[model samples]
Structures are given as structure tokens and as C-alpha cells.
Target: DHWSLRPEAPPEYRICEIKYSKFGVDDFDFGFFNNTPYPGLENNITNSYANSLLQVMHYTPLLRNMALQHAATACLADPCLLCELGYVFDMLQKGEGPSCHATNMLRALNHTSNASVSGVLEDIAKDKNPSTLVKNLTMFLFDKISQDYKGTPPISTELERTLFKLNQPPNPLDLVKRLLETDARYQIKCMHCQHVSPRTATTFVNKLCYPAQRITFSQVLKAGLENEAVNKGYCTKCQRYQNLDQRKIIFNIPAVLALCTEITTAEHRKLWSTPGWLPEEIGIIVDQGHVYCYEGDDLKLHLNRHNITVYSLVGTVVNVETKSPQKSHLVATVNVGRAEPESKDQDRWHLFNDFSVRGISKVEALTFNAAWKMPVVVMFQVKAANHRFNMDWKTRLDTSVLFRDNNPHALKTYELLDRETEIPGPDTVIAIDTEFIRLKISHAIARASVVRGQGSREGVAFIDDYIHIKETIVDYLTEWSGITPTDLDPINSQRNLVSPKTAYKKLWVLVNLGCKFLGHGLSQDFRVINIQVPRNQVIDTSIIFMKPPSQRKISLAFLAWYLLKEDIQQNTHDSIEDAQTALKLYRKYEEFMANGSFHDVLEALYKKG
Candidate 1:
């Protein structure tokens, strides 16, 4: 419980014995020095550039912690890759030699017929830059180790498959994936029928969207994970395409998290700075962005079951130019040591720009936001432990409720079709709309509606009978739902109120019959009803008919008036009417598609306006 209070011990890497070169600028002296004594590009291609990164990794507190935790058994537990890596790390960190056994591995793996591996490594580093070679060599070592140490237990099957699919010598950019792969699960829900499709996958890092304008780290991250709009396809439960959205739940997080910044062009940097951007403890609220406390009183790091891990900004690699088609120079700024609450200069930072290594203030390092100093890669270690806890629900209501009640109607025996199976031809799609009533602080499904596209039918409705629930009804949502106390009168023989389960089951049967689903922002509809559907089968009129720059979902009333010259939801919302309106909008979209106007609209829809 008091892990953070342990007295800090200076790292024991025998760094003093190492020598520095006179070739590069002496900007900072963290412990190790830059350049080799026997220079003239002796190890520049093979070790010089690679050596700098080696220095950075060794100095990184997280890597050191990880090494110490498993070092004793790493190489002895069998002749595995990690064992060799442990051995190499020890040699490099301790011995002040020109070369070591680990360096030998880079040389051996890198060699071809005429030139040695060291020569090849140097050539690659010279041609593509050191960062590129560093990544390539790391992946090479990992792959070779994976092959050589066949008996080693893999972290996950997803990781294994992903590794296997890469080129024989994996690309360097894939280094982040190899070092930081984590497990995640996706819960997909169909908006129309409330069917759920659950899938599990793996991820290495959050690939943030490249904002067109200046944006903050939190803002870009939020946009990348949750705010972007997407269409979903066919639902077996509803038999139609519907708007579908997925939420990620991460189960594993790596100690070191690498974020690949794809900032290109000057405009990308202009959008980075917004005066209103205020960061919080949570940073960004994407499914993968959450904080936790693993040790003691550190506030900068966190962890979450959604696979979101908090990290302290420790290292950043920046490109000096903003407009260079290819970055001509790569430089790195790194936190030289961990911050201590009571110690001064403990939070030292250093700049390593290919021979120009110097000390920099922590404040300067943290605030280096000039677009021209384009950060290409940033490394973060697990954040310091704090007192806070992330109490977000482990599972969404849709999945949780299904688990709790075991309702036969909510559960289905339908087996998903294989990708190899031929899908039936398209038919007239169905549109869906849903309503909810406030149940205390939360809302529960009060009514649902579905209608056949290209039809004038009034469609079907599944209204709740104000069924007794465990929680008290806080509001009937009459202003929005049009549900009234009179509508629940038991004496009314025409009032056929059904449980949400029964309604969902009826919809599921129709979905399995092979119909597509349509709706405006139907993902929310699925959430309210607690169901999943085939994500690819959905046709969201909200997305198809949406105009540029406005990320928000347009209302049915607005779309109906704009396209059909009909007003809807002026009074209380009518699910059937809303469904019909969405259907009309979709039909109009189809017309646009036939005339090639749809492509123009889609172009606008996709751009970051």
C-alpha cells in the first residue's frame, strides 16, 4: 500500500565507466556522454545512433523498474529472447566498453553477405535516420527472439497473430505494437433491434486523429476514440442495416506507452493550440483514456480496465522543420530522472539532437509546442501513483442487464454467419426510432418503433405499460415522449404494454429474417434498449445527410423540414414519424448517390471541417 514511500535508490547501471565523444555538443550530462572515443563514424551507423536510444531507455525509470522486477529470472528461465535482452541491458548499462554482447546481437541480426550487420545498421541509420533504424532493429530482435525461443509463453494470441502477419523483418514503426500491445474488447450495438455483437482484439496505442487545425492532446485524443461518426452494417437481430457504434473496454496496459504523432503540414499545427483547452486529471475521456492509482502520492499516472493507461510525459522526438517533405533532422528531449517531492534538480531534462545534448528546464520541455518543432514520437511511462480512483462502470447497461436477468428473450441462440458465407441480396430496409422515460437518474426504454423503408405504413410500436421497475419513475418524459398517465390505464383494452425484453425479442425475430436497419443516430437507440446488432448493416441517415463542420447529430425535425418540407417532433416525439422521416432522408440520399451528388456530400462529411 505504501509502495511510493520507499526510499529512492540511484540506478546502478555502471554508467560512469562509459566514455563520451568530442564530436557532438555537450548540452547535458545526465550520466552517459555522447560520441565514441574511436570516432570517424565508427559506430555511428551501428551503435552511435542506436546507443543514444539505449541510453534513453536505460535512464527511463519505467524500463529500469521493469528490468529489475524480472531480471533475475529473465535469462535463466530458459534461453529466451527476453533473457538475452536482460543480459544485453545489464551489459550496456554496466560495462563502459566500446561494444558488448547485446551490441553483438544487433550486429549479428543486421549483417548481410559483404557488409556486417553493424555496417548495414549504420547504412540504414544514415539513410533513414536513427529513429527509423532503432525501431527496425528492435522489431527484428523481437521477431528473431520469438522464433528462436519457441517455448516461451506469449502474452496473447492476438499479439502473436499480429506479429506473424507483419513482413519477415517487421517494420520499425511497428515497434510500438511489439512493446506495448494490450488486450481490448469491443461491444457493438445495433440501434434498431437492440442486438449485441461482442468482439475482442488487441491494440498497441491510441492513433489520434490528425486534426486539421491546432488542437490539444486531450482534444485530439477524444476525437480519435469516441467523437468520430461511423456507419454500421446488417443486424441479425433486426435483419436490417442500422447505425451502430462500438465502445472499447481494455483489459491490459503496458508499462511504457508510445504515441506515434502523425503531425504533418503547417495547418496541422495551427489547430493544436486553443485558448480554452484546460486539461483535467482524466486528460481525455475516450474509452481508452482513464487514470488510476497503483502506488502512493503521484498524480500524473493512472490505469483503467478499458485499457486506458495514464502516463507521464518522459520523452519526445521532434522534427525541426514544419514544411520539409521528409524530416531532415530528428531530436529528442527526455526526462533525465524521476521527480522527487522533496528533491531539487531531480526532475532534470536533457535534449539529444544527434550530438547536441544539453540540459533544459522541465518547464521548457513540457511547453515546447511550436509546430515547427514537430514531435514525431513521444514516450510515456506509467504515471506516479495518486489517491484517486476511476469508478466508471465496468460494463454498459446493455451487456450487464443481459448478464443479470438471463431473460430468454434478451438472449439469442443465433450463430453468427462466417465471412465466407454468401450474404443475401439487399431488400427494402427498415428504419427505427426509440423513446425513453426517466427512471430516477437513468432513462429506460419507454417505447420503440420500426417501419419499412419506401412504405407509407404507420409501422409498429412497442410501448411500455409503465411496468413496475425496481427504481421509482422520476419523470414520464411526457414533453419529449408523449407518454401520459392516461396511456397506462389498465382498464384500456387497447393498451398492450410490453416489457422491453419482449419488444426487443420481437424485433430480433424480424432482424434475423434478413432486413436492413435505418435510423438517425440509431446507436443511442440501441443503447437505450440494451441490444447489439451487426454493425455493418446499419444506414445512418444522420451521417449520410449531415452537412460539414457540425459534428453533432441533426434532429429528425430539422432533416424533415430541410428535405421533405415536413416538420416533425414539434410536439412530443413520435417514434414512428421519426423513423419515417429518417427513411425519407435516406431515400433522398439514394437519389443523390445515383446522380453522383452523394460523393460530393460524402467528401464534405469526411473532412475535418
Candidate 2:
């Protein structure tokens, strides 16, 4: 018997090797030479251009050191990237080597074709002018790296075998997702149903959208982090569209924050005018009012009443001037020092505008308020911990998967709707079945039947009436309803039709008498009539006679044949017969429950566990 379920244990894995750079801020050199055919067009040779910007990413010493070590050993996940990048950066520093080969190799890695490498080198050597931007080229590398990455292996019980398979040999782009992807968990709650749904997803970039009206960076940042309830949206658990409130929090904060800003609207332009805003250091608060805070020289890790994850602004690729939609001048900026800790030596920042690299003040970089300098893509370092720890574990509902032996609408725990009118006292246990007519816009009751008793005194008919409908008939549903045009004719002498109000008025007498309502899925019946009965007042045969917990809902016709040794609703449905079948099925379940058989089976199941 393989009917066991267990909670999955949390996975333990390292992001990367911990290797910090030994060099200090002043010790490291930033000057570089342009080897492209068109000197100023280093920005157009974006791939090589981004390779130059990466040299300044020393703010995160571990990442920068990793690159250098990988380059030196020529033993990286993607040796092609390491080899090409290493050669280019060396040329930028020592002014030796063919720079065109560096850019061409990058294109080959992205295209995954050897022909692309040869083709690009030939094209760049032949043509003096090539058109592209540093940002565009850098994004191509990022996109291609992510696209080519091989995801985690399929889950299996043989843990050792799985681990052995992964260790045999790894994909070249495996480290890309591990390094760049941000893992975040989201919680969404429906306002009407009050049902909560949780999800976890990995994202490479957080794309900011423009708001309806012009708003400041603070307002925009708040909106981006918090998506409040607005209009109705589909909820799987509720099975309907309803207003929803969604909240997002990062679980695994990556080394860098890649924010892609879309300046398509007037409100987006306000990011420039906004005074004290940093592109990377936007503070985001998580659940339960707990924030990340630092304490003194050594970074402390614990929950605080009010705290923040100070994302150190590292580098950015800004669009300088747009001559046309397809043409633009791009530049890169990066900070020096602050890679290891906050000190005076790590305060300087540098702006790499084409071939010329110059020093800039902290204030100038922090307050990037120039309209011409549109920050297209900005990267930030995760200076502190941004994760959930020592918090209550949340159990999310799996709307798509149904657990065996679990019933959402069990008799003892089901919710009851608010009563519209007082229900009268009981006479005896009864069964009722209703048939509805499908209209163009809505459903309306066409016929209803009620019966009392079971077994020897089975089916004492209390009421059987054909309801008259006011709406234009789109479908009589005659085959199922056992009702036709003649039966609903207003003036026909043979017709025994009564308006819905009159029909319900007659049935309301027994309902008020406090008779227990028994039927196959009575909820639908009550919903159609807009009646609210206490949960205790209903005995649903559909639920009682349903096949064991793991099986889907059983129909009234199937239950009648299997339990009562009678065939019902064979050709067309008969409401009175269906009502009688439900009454008998309920009696059968009642007897089974009374004999302790139901309890005995459940006990055996638990004992098996």
C-alpha cells in the first residue's frame, strides 16, 4: 500500500563559493583603452562595452573575485564566456589583443552556433560602423544565459541517485539562474470569499509599469510593492471572480537587483524630479512588520520593529540621447570601494561614458535627476539579509489537487448562509428534487417534487408541481425536465401549471413545518430558490452516498442502481422517482453510520498509517 503522504523537507544548497577580492579601492585601476574600429563607438559594440562596465562591479567583491578567478583558471560553467570576457578585460587594461573577437565570441555563445562567431568577426573587421547599445548587448547576454540554463532535476524518492546524476556533469548555464534569479513568495487573498492562495516564483527582472496619474517615486515604489484590491479577478478556490489583494516578499535575495524602468508615461518621468530617491535602495517592508536591520561593524541578522535592506547602488546603463527610436547613445556607471564594508576608502563612484572613464561624486550618482540621462537598467547589491526566518510556516491550499478522505463541505463543519426568513418546525424527514429551465441569461425553476419516508414506507409524495416561467424560453430542457411546450401552455386545459411564487408558497408550508431537507446536493436547490437553511436542517444524500473519499461525486442515478437495486433517470428524469431514490439512499447511509461500520472503516485506515 503506497498511500502515504509526507511534507517535503527544505532543500539545502549553496548559491556560490565565498571568495572576496584582496585589492582595495585606490589600488584597483579603472582606466581602459578603446580598440574598436570606431573609437567612440565602444557604446555601439555593447557586448564588449558591458564587459568594460563589469570591471567596476567590484562593489560586490565576492562576485568580482569569482569572475577573475574563473577567468584565470579558465574553468567556469561556461568557459566560452570566461575566455572571451577575460581576453576583453585584459585588452581594456593592457591594450593588447583583437577586441572584435571578444564581441564575436559573445554573440556565438548567445546564438549557440559556431557560424555566428566566424560571421560576426568577419563583419566587424570589414565594416567600420556597427549599430547597437551597451545595454542592448548586455541584456542579450543576460537573456541568452537565462534561456540556455538547465533547470533542476525532476523530484524522485532515490535522493542519492538524483544527487549522483547532478554531480556527474553540470550544464554550462546552470550558474546563471542560481546567481541572477530572485526567489519570492506571494500571497493573494480574495475580498469576497476571504480565501487565501499562495505561490512562489523566480524572476530575473522587476519591470516597473507606469501609473494612471503622475506620482512620485515613493508613491510608485509603494504601488509596485503593494498591489491593493481593485476589481474582480478569477480565484480558483472560490470558483468565481472577486476582488483580490496581493502581497510579494523576496525569500532568496540575489546578489544584484536588476530593475528595468519603462519611461513610457508622464508619471515615469517624475522619477527624475523626485529628490531623495536612489535607483537601487528602495526599502520594502515584509509581513508581520519585521524588517532587516544592521547593528554596528558586523552586520547583525535578526528581526526588528523597523528596519530596511540597504541595497547598495552598484552600476547602471543609462540612455544618453535618442536620435531616433532605433538609435541612441548609452553609457555605464559603477561605484568603487563599498564592496566589503562601509568605509571612507570605498566612497568614490565612476561614470564610464563611452571610451572615457571619469570620477563622479556620491551626490551626483545618488541624485540622477537629469532628464536626458534615462536609467534603462540599474543593478543593486543585496547589502543585508532579505529573507523569512523564524516565522510561522504557511500551509497553502492546492486548488488543483484534492486530498483523499478530505471533504470541504463535511456536515459538521460546513458554513450556512444568512437566513432570509424564519424556517418553521419539523413534521418528518423528507426528500426533494428540482428541475430547472435554462434561459438565455439565467436559469429558472421549471418543476419541483417532494417525497417523504424510505424503505417499507417509501416515497409518500407531498408535492409535485410544474412551475410557470416568465422569461422568454431559450431552452425547455424537455429531455431532462420531462416538461414540454404543452405542459407550460398558460391557456391549455390539460396543463397543471402554477407560477413559481405559487409553487414555492405550497412547498414553504412543509419547509416551515421544520421538515429536514434531503436531496442529492441540496445546495444547488437552495441557491436557485434563494433560501437559507441551517446546516443541521439538511441531509445531502449525494454527499452521504458518495464513493469513498478519494473518488469523485456520485450521481443520484448511479446510487439508485448500486444501493437501492432500482434504475432511475434512464431515458429522461422523473423528479418524484429521483426524490424517492435520494430518500432511500439517505436511509441506507443512516443505517450504515448507526451500525458503527463507517467509524470502523475510518479507524482501520488510521491504524494502517
Candidate 3:
């Protein structure tokens, strides 16, 4: 019942002799560091120039640039050789480019089957994006190919493959390790790239596009398990080149999308390339996998008329583009297209209708005017219209004739209203119960207002019976509008009958009693109850069916029907039955949450949402 479950205990004592041992050292060899002597310092030539040179060389901007470029060039053309080179240029500017340009280049690079070039590309695409030494090696190769190999591209490329075989013949016995790694960011900007939107922060959390990769090489250093031990530490016995040459290509898979940032255009690309201008200067790039054109901003670029077609790596254009580019030069805005469509919206009909039917008028009136007074007056008329519409059926009915013979609990007529109390604790199972006064007397009372009958106007029921209890509740409700009792009628419901000030005072007692107000469609109940529940603290049974593409139907009555079966009574539910139904649903949810599989448990929730 309480959060502090167990009673506190006192401290206990432990008795044991502890002994530690030192490895294979003899007793004579065991000695302290104090026994050894230290070196004596000698004076040498003090040159500030040498010190300054060392410091400046290590910290010099020119030196850093040179080293970075050299190291970056040496990096393998990992993943996609040509595309990775572009990344080097982009990262040099600290994340610059037309995000689409990188992807387009990757596609072009992936289409080529040059084995040697492929191997180089794979090395770069993997984690850590190839070491600086590797990039430097690639840069050296690119330079070598550009200057020495003067032959035109696609002129019998098998010559390069034959050369690669001569250089790096495959050795099946060689042990190689595979590695995967990843990198992620929200603040970084690249005018040319797949950029996630700030509004939809959720996409970055789980999207496969942001897959981080790192390089893996050699064999496992040491095996953690006993039976299948890892390859022994790299030593003399381990054959270094017995496996194969470094340039040998194995899996020349295409460079898949690593991460999507933001889409961009040639204009966008130019903005990033301008000297001294930063990528952040560009306006917001929406995360919907598309670059948005701000409504009236001149700086904003829209590619609606561009010839570029955004194509997935699979070769199919995912967007509804009017035309496709057959050549690279003709591609104006590279990789531009309509954004992906959202998944189909489900069963929100009730919520959608509620706003349309009941709230649209009031919302329209409020939005009609900018001035506070005009909007307020319009809003008043809108709300009055809504109230009158809601009360149309009740206005013509007589409560006396409807309930005269139907009062099952005769004197308990006022106790028919219901309120639920939910217990929220660490345990998955929640207990729900309802409380109300059981009236014992039946007496005559006049109508508080005129009531309509079959032949004439009917008077509304008025009674002093249960007046103290009703008055006490009403007084509390005056301060706390949420203090609804089990007996409060809907039509004559003094729910708003009591003022906000008094109803608020009684809310303190409810909170102290560990009362968690609940219902099936409880969003409004909580609002009427006027007690805001912390997001995680409140569990809506309706949400249990909100699983992803699964078949589980979650509902209060359905859960009760399934769990209790015949034990659950239907129709004319007293306060106890209603409360028990909620608690039962909560208990089943708890059970599933504890041990159910993702598919099994989320079956109902996903269906509902």
C-alpha cells in the first residue's frame, strides 16, 4: 500500500581474515620503491627558440591544416571511394555541402565494379572513416592515378583488376575482422546532406540512416569464453601477410545511407562554398528529409522546377517528380523530391469528430478577431450555442417519470453517480475502487425547475434529502470544481454547479488519500477533475492497444470480458463494478508489461493508437 515497502534494518558485522598474494616473486625480491634512488639533474643549454618552435609546430594552424589534409588523404576510399573524398571536403568545412550531393555521388560510385577501387571505398565507409594514414594513402593513390595513369575511364577497366590481382591475391586462410561504428549529431549543419528536423527530434533517435560505422581489422585480441577462445595476441607466430595482400577486395557492397541530414540544392551548395561563410547561415532545413522553402524568404531555395530527381539507392525515384535527369550536368537541384508520406492515421475519428462538432464554432469565433474584447464576446456566444446544442435532448424530458419506477435503490437515487480512485505504485497492478454514500431514506421533494411531461411541462427534481452530504460536497466543489461525487447527475449536475474556488480546496484531501482519478476515455475526465497528471505517472488503458503494426485490441470492457469472462457482470454497473473494471484492466496490463513479448504485449496498444 505504501511506497516505502520494507522496514529499515540495522547494520551487521562481518568476521574474516583477508590475505593477498604476490605473483612468482621470491621473498628476497619483495622490496619498496623507497630503496631505489632517483636521477640527478644536470643543467643544459636553455633556448627559448627551441621551446617556441616545439610549441608553435605542435599548435600552428598551417601545420595542423597540412597534417589534417595529409592524414585525410591517406584514408581509404572506404564505403564509396569517390563519395568519401567528397566527405573529406565537406568535413574540412566542418560539415558543408548539398546533403543530396553526397548521396548522389555515393550512388554513382556504387554503380562501378572496379574491385581495387571498391576495396578502397569499403575501408573508408567503415568506422572511423579510414585513419589519417589511410586517407593519405588514398590521396597518394588518387594523385598517382591522375598523373601516371593517363588512360581514359571505362576503357577496359579489367586492366586495373588484373593489376589488383597481381598486387593482392586473396588467401582464404587469412583471418580478417569486420567492424561497425556510428556517429550522430543534432546541432551540426551541412547544406548538402540528409538532415533531420528539429521539430521531429524523434527521427534521429532510431532511424537506420544515422547508422554509425567504425573499421575492424585483424582477429579478436582475446576470447572471453572458454570453449571458443579468441585468436591469440598478435605476435611472431601470427602470420601477418599469409592471408592476402592489403588491396584485395572481398565484399564490395554498395555504400548504403549512413545518416540523413538535410536536403539542399546547387544554390545551397554554392552558399556553403563561399569563403568565410558558414553552413549555419542557411535557414532551417526540415527533418522531413526535405529542404523547406520559407514562405517569403529570399534566401530560401525551392527546387520545384529543378530537373533533379531524388532516387533511393535501389534506382527507383521515391518521390512524385514530374521529370528525371538522364545526365549529371542536366541535374539542376540534385536529389530533390517530395518528402515521404506519413503512415495512415487510424481510428482518430472520435477525437476528430469531437473537435469538429463541438469545438469548431468556438475556435472559429476566437480566431475571428485579434482584439481581446471582440474575441471574448464571440467566444461567449459560441460556447452558449454549444451548451444549448448539448442540452437539447435533456430539455424536453421529465426526470420524475423516467426514474419513478426505475429507482432500483429507491432511497439511493442520489448515489448513482460514480468516481474512480486508482492506486499508482511501483507494482504493475493497480487497484481501482469507487466511494459514495448509500442513501437510506425516500421522501417527497418539489421540482427545483419546471419539468416537461408527455402532455405538459415537467418540473426539475429538487430535494433536501441527503442535503448535508450533497451540501458538503457542493461546498468543497465550490473551491474545487473537480470534486465530483458519485451521485452528481449529468443534466442537473452541479459539477459546474459549484464555483472553482471551493472545489479546489477539497482536491488537497483527494491527493493525500492516494487517489489517482481514472476512466477509459479519461483525457477530459482529468480536465473536469482539474488535476493534471504527470505524463509518465498516468497510464491510459486506451494506450495498451497502441502497438506498432500489431493486432491487439485494448479496452476496459474487452479486458474485463477476456480476463474475468462470466465473472464480470454487464449492464447497470454500480460504482464498485465500474471501479473494479478499471483495476482489472490495469492488472492485466501490468502482467503483460512484466513478461509479455513486444508483439504480444503491444498487440492491443498499437491497434488502438
Candidate 4:
């Protein structure tokens, strides 16, 4: 898949275009930039400064699995950051659409108890600097989320207990903290009095101290943990200001080790400009809780007594400096497959610039130019933990979400499925259609309706849900979606009000149960719903009625008109009616196929249209 085909178009319109020949893949790849396997985040607002770090975390196998597990729980606290993070992580994992907007997460930050207090959420009118933005977030959000992670209610399901493997860590968040947070023994020696002051200072992002004479990155990293002279330091023993030498030797090396170097000064850029500066992989071994970092030859030499784990470059959040804050923004270099299973070839890196993702060489990602590219922070992950992720979110799915009925009013239009005896399976065929409101660049699902297929209460509508919207609606799109102003509002709506979670979970249940879904246009539906369904399990009415070869697909209305001899979607779109129409059209198609008139009828419809 060549991603450079549509340079003029935006991400939302076209994701990728397949190519061959002039668009073919050969032995040698000079470069044919491809799409990032994971979805990219949109960075339009001020708070999108966190997108870079968020992408880095998404690629981290252990962290990504932990976040998804948190989301699977029944945490319903409004404006919760962890909940929002889990929601976004799940979306990023399953989002095959062009890009995703972190609106919910950003909105959650706006209400956090200490986000504004920590100056992380600066006022829009205030002058903003993104140099330490990721650093501050790593400091503030990590600490806050750690508490939320610990405070989460005990997961309440046999399936969850087994899949989540509760026995691994009494507190999984604590294990996550070790990845971003590092603790070092700070030993301060008063030069005059020879008094030793020992203190354990822990920090999230370890900032690197530049060597006076530019040298290797390993020395730079060791220098940060080694001796530093305090020109004006208070000496408690001598009772006066005296010079002191302090060494902060790290005891443990986190799996996803965080490192940074401030690029505000011109002097620091000279050292970064050195060629062959950064190493591709480094080894770290913890000998009895005392850590030692090694590179190249030395790592190979010390193989006998110590157990060394190789750490590969996971990603880097780069600050593309500019003359103005408006143009200056954050981007990231991420390994596209750290969470994926091990492969033979080298790791694939991608430049994540907001919604624009391009596959890049390892050199392009690690090397910086003389002009403006500066790394905000660099992340490294243990090579052995490449595929150490529990990505199977559906297998241990808590089925409780499907049985939930938060709707107060009794259903009159559609009959709800009986949970006791009517759960669907592979034998069942469902016709599903969802309605959405135009909500400020987002198409929030307003309603979800599924119709029963033949052999059951064929053509009867079941699982009709009116999703409650928390975001402000820009347009109801009543002409197309049939969603009224009061329909989605929780206060005024009299229909079955379900959350986006409950609504998505119902279909997710059927999808995992191996049920076949018959729909008119399911690509857009599944894309917006943030779920992936295989082609074999889907029977799209639009594709079933399409002219033999690949061509323009017919509309559900026209299909109903030409085949079923029924006029539908006449006034406005309703999920229930549209689903029923799709079901009837499918039956008509089956009937024609049985009579050997399928080809004739398809040609007649094409001729009529």
C-alpha cells in the first residue's frame, strides 16, 4: 500500500491506495511511504501537544495492553483521564479509519483536578511553549493516573480474572510505573567536610546533561546518573555554602526507559549533529537491583554473570522548532510493530505528524538535521518484550455489557431480544444499520438497530439503541439521519438511551459470536464504530446487488425499489426501517439465486438504474 498517492487529499477522505508496476513493490525499496498500521491522532487544539507521547505509549506492548484492560472494566466516572485513555487506546488499536480525534481525552484533561494547577493545561490566550510539554505530562499525568489505576474497583468477572491474569501483579499500575519512572540513589559529598548525604530521588523523565566536550550518547547517559558539581550548595556539616559532588546512580532500568536532552541552547545542537551518534540497540543488566547500561562491544563482553536485556528504540517525540508557536509543533518517530510478533527484517519506523503518517528508515527517525528537528523525549523498549501484549480483547470479553438496559421507557416500536434464550450465534444472520449526528467533525452514533434474518422472527427489529451524546451537537442532520434535537439528549429523550459503550458492545458480541451481519454500507459503519469484521462474516446488501465486476454500488433505496418492489427511506433515514429493508432485499436476492435468475435480475437492475 503506497501512502503517497493522494497528497492533495486529507486523511479523513482517503486512507491508502493500493498500487502495482509504476506502483509496484520491487526487491529494493528506495522508499514508497506506507500508512502506519496503528491510527494517528489529530492535533488541531492546544492540548494535542500530548499526541506525540500518547503515540509512543500506544506502541509500547506492555503499556498498551494495560490501558486496554483498564478500559474493559466498568469504570463510569465522568471526565476520568484513565477511562478516557483506555477509550482512546482501544480506538487507536482498532481504528482503520484515516485518523482519530482525542476529543474525549482532551475534554477529560480539562476537568482533571490538578491539570491546570500543574500548568500542563495552560490558558489558550497565554503564550505556550512545547519544549517541556511532554516532560510535564509524563510527570503530572503519570502520577495522577497511577492513583486512578490503583483506585479502580476490582474487576468483577470470571472471564476477566482469567484473561487479565490478576495473579501477575497485585497492582498492575505499579508495574507500569517502573517503565516511565526511575529511581536513583543520590549521594552528595560535601567537599570540605567529607560528609555524605544519601537520598533516593525518583523522576519520570531522566534529562541528560550535555558533556562539555561532545562524546558518545552512552557517556551522556552515564553523566546524567554520575557526578555533577553543585557550585553553590548548602553544606549541613560545615554550616556554609560549599561545592559538592552528587552522583545519582540508577538502581533499576525501566523497560520503556525515558530520556531527554534540552535543545534550547545552540551549544546542545552541535553535539546532536554528530554523525553515528545514537546507537540502534543497547543492553542493560540489573545485578542484584544495581543497574548498568552497555552498548556494542562492551554489551557482548559482559555476558557471563549478568542477565542483560537488549533495549531497542521504541519512538521519539520530536519538536519541530519554528519562529512562531503557531507553526512549531510536536511529532513522533514510532516503531510500527513493537507490539507485533517478532519478524525477520529490521524494525519499521514511522513519522507520526498529527494525522499524516509516513514509513521512514531507522536513520531518518534517529538522525536529526542542523536546522530544527529536536527530540522532546526518546523512548526505548526491551527487545524481548516486543510481542508481550494481551491484544485479544474480545476473547475474554465481559458479556455483561450486552445485557444492560439503562433505558427507562418501555419499547413500543421494536421487541428487545430475550437475554435468557435469544442470544445470537454463528447460525444467525443480522441486518444492522446505525444513525449518526454531525457533531463537530465527529459523526457520533445516534442510533443502532439490528433486524433478525430469515428462520427466526425474520425482518423483525431487535436491539434498537438511542445513544446518549455528551458532546455538543453541531447538526442533527434530521433529513438524512432522522435524529431530532431532543432525541439524543439524556434529559429530553424518551427512547432507549444507551451509552456508546453499551451500543458498541452489543454488535461486538454478535461479531465475536461468529454471526453474519447483512448491511447496506458496513465499511463506514464499522469504521465509525471502531471495530473490525472479516469479509466472510459480512453480507453487504450494496455489494450483493452490485454489477458483477467492481463498479459503483447501488443505494439501498434503489435496491429495494428494483428488487423488493418496495419504496423505503422515502422521507428520512431510520435505522430500524433501513435494516429491515436490507434484510428483505437479502431474502429477495436468495430467492432469485435459488431460481437461477440472479444474473438476469442483476443485469435488469443495472439496465434500469
Best by TM-score: 4
Cα lDDT of model 2 by residue, 1-609, tens digit: 110011211011001111224532112222233332211113223234343334443334433433333333312233244334433433343232212223333443444434243222324333211213333344444444344333222111122223224555334344444456655666678888888888666566555555654344435444443334445689988799888876665554444556566566555656554544544344444444222323222222333334355555676665554333433344555665444345656556655554444565665555443344456666665544222011010111111111112222233211111133222236457778888787652456777776655323447654565666655788888887777877677775143465554455434434434568888987667645534455566889766654475534567776677667788757688777778788888777778789968665334333321
Arrange candidates, best lDDT first: 4, 2, 1, 3
List clashing residue pairs in candidate 4.
none
Candidate 3 lDDT over 1-609, as tens digits, reads 211111211010001111233511112121221121110000111111111111111121222222222222212222333223323222222211111112222322333345234343443433222221122222332333222122212112222223223355322111000001111212222223322122111110111111121211000100100011122122223323122111111121111111111212333223322322211111212232222212212233443424121212110000111112211100000100111122343111000110011111211211111111010000000010110111111122112211222233434323211123222222322222222222221111111111111111111111112111222221323222222343354344432222221222222122222334433544433322323333443455665545545433365566666555644444433333444466556666667767865466454333333
For model 4, the local distance difference test gives 0.69
By lDDT, the best candidate is 4
- Model 4 lDDT per residue over 423-488, tens place: 777787888999878765456678888888865577787778887766678988899888887777
TM-score for each of the candidates: 0.40, 0.41, 0.21, 0.77
Give all candidates' CA lDDT scores: 0.46, 0.48, 0.23, 0.69
Model 4, position 76, has a per-residue lDDT of 52
Q: What is the Å distance of residue 176 in model 2 from its true position? A: 7.1
lDDT of 1 by residue, 365-456 (tens): 54434444445555655554211111111111011111122222342212222224322224646677777787643456666666655433
In model 1, state the lDDT of residue 268: 61
Candidate 1 scores a C-alpha RMSD against the true structure in Å of: 29.2
| Residue 253, candidate 3: C-alpha displacement in angstroms | 80
TM accuracy, model 2:
0.41
